[PDB]
């Protein structure tokens, strides 16, 4: 005997925040492995235009 309660409440908080943690591992790669990768090239080439003096 045990007054077990909260099977859906433990499957909403576990359910929401593991989508926010799944909304980060697709977005923090998109802003670092793609966006900062794209700003790496434009910071490089514009530094190879200021070299010409």
């Amino acid at each position: 005997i045990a007054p077990i309660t909260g099977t859906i409440k433990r499957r909403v908080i576990m359910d929401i925040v593991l989508g926010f943690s799944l909304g980060g591992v697709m977005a923090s790669y998109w802003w670092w492995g793609f966006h900062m990768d794209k700003i790496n090239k434009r910071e490089k080439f514009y530094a190879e235009l200021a070299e010409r003096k």
Binding site: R10, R11, M14, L18, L22, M26
Partner: protein
């Protein structure tokens, strides 16, 4: 003791399968470019 190992096993092959959906639902142009660059 219940929701520490039974809530896990329902969810370990789920995210192993859920990412396989988005790599086909959204990642499918990463194959037609790969197959025929010509």
């Amino acid at each position: 003791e219940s929701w520490v190992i039974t809530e896990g096993r329902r969810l370990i092959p789920e995210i192993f399968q859920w990412s396989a959906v988005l790599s086909v639902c959204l990642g499918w142009p990463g194959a037609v470019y790969f197959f025929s660059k010509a």
